[PDB]
């Protein structure tokens, strides 16, 4: 009893302008420096998302 229907449807456109402016501050490509820790010692690295 599968009922997904494709059209189916759608568309648209426109433009515008106005203006205004505013402032903050900037947004639109921020880089995040995640830090992982499992014992007293720690590793840290940076990544980006659009």
């Amino acid at each position: 009893k599968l009922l997904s229907a494709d059209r189916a449807g759608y568309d648209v456109l426109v433009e515008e302008l106005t203006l205004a402016n505013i402032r903050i501050e900037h947004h639109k490509m921020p880089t995040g420096a995640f830090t992982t820790r499992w014992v007293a010692a720690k590793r840290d690295s940076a990544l980006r998302l659009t």
């Binding site: 830090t35 820790r37 840290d44």
Partner: protein
């Protein structure tokens, strides 16, 4: 640095100091403890009548 810090952060307790280059006197620096006590043992070395 507060994230690596976790539960305890921004809680300075004691600050040690040291020389960058090496020369003359070694200078491992935490004798400041006996600086507020300006002349604890040095004032009276071996004075006796």
């Amino acid at each position: 640095w507060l994230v690596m810090a976790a539960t305890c952060g921004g809680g300075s307790f004691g600050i040690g100091k040291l020389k960058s280059l090496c020369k003359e006197f070694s200078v491992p620096k935490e004798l400041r403890d006996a600086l507020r006590v300006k002349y604890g043992l040095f004032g009276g070395k071996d004075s006796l009548e």
